[PDB]
Write a protein that binds this ligand. Structure first.
Ligand SMILES: Cn1cccc(-c2cccc(-c3cnc4c(c3Cl)[C@]3(CC[C@](C)(C(N)=O)C3)CN4)c2)c1=O
Length: 291
């Protein structure tokens, strides 16, 4: 079973499908309208045939149905019908920040500051549940028509959680195993502070339209990050950005996780605690998008 609370019902008994969303980047996703209330939702459809391995989807639904926070895209339930699984989600009408900056160009520092504050609020919540997103990036920060910010897509988190469960299942007799081997098997080898680093990279992405080293082969990037002398990335255009933004990048991109600030701590940083950060900043961005 993929989840004990799935609705065994055709979602089209409750919703009218209106438009495909995401260009396929996120799978088969449909804008849909509640037949009763008229509210809009996003329905993601995934194949779920009787013999398929459902462990990762099981974990993703378990994450979704235990999150309830304004800055996390809302989960409304899942439908299993004729071997298709539909996940019903809050609809974010402006798409992801990547969809937006590909049209508008780089965000303003204030716009990035608001986005970062809202994401950190979602992360603080997730981390208070001992959850890790593990895939923070512009493509997974969604914007609704009101200019509000929603973290989305726990697919990677689900894949990781499912992998940990499987390795635990087959870890075998432990009596000769070193503690660090057991720890990696039970806990994964890292912690939630990886999300803080990814948010730092995301801030550069919103500022420059590419993450650092985007034009370097991925395997080379992975190897470089493991060298003892690896240097955290920086914003390239020094004069475009305030000292507070440069420092925000410096502290989020602390390479030792034992020294990297938590989400709650980062929320006290000058860049994200300054006044004037509200959704009007993103409505400005969406107005630029419209022109
Ligand atoms: C043509 N057009 C018009 C308007 C908006 C878009 C558009 C573009 C990119 C993203 C989205 C989007 C909005 N809201 C959403 C989701 C998504 Cl993909 C998810 C469902 C699953 C999900 C992956 C998750 N795991 O949360 C994200 C559910 N909430 C919409 C568009 O393309």
């Amino acid at each position: 079973v993929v989840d004990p609370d799935i609705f065994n019902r055709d979602p089209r008994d409750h919703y009218d499908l209106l438009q495909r969303l995401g260009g396929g980047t996120y799978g088969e996703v449909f804008k849909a309208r509640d037949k009763v209330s008229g509210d809009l939702v996003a329905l993601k459809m995934v194949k779920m045939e009787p013999d398929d391995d459902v462990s990762t989807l099981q974990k993703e639904i378990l994450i979704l149905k235990t999150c309830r926070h304004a800055n996390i895209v809302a989960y409304h339930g899942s439908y299993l019908w004729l071997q298709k699984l539909w996940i019903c989600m809050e609809f974010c009408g402006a798409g992801s920040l990547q969809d937006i900056y590909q049209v508008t160009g780089s965000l303003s520092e204030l716009q990035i500051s608001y986005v970062c504050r809202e994401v950190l609020q979602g992360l603080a919540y997730l981390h208070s549940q001992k959850k890790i997103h593990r895939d923070i990036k512009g493509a997974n920060i969604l914007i609704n028509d009101a200019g509000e910010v929603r973290l989305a897509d726990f697919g990677i988190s689900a894949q990781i959680g499912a992998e940990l469960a499987r390795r635990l299942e087959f870890i075998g007799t432990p009596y000769w195993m070193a503690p660090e081997v057991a720890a990696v098997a039970l806990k994964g080898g890292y912690n939630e502070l990886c999300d803080i680093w990814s948010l730092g990279i995301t801030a550069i992405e919103l500022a420059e339209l590419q993450p650092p080293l985007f034009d370097v082969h991925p395997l080379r990037v992975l190897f470089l990050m493991t060298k003892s002398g690896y240097q955290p990335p920086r914003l390239k255009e020094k004069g475009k950005w305030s000292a507070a933004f440069h420092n925000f990048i410096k502290v989020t991109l602390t390479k030792s996780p034992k020294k990297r600030p938590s989400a709650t701590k980062m929320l006290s940083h000058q860049l994200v605690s300054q006044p004037g950060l509200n959704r009007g900043l993103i409505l400005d961005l969406l107005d630029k998008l419209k022109n």
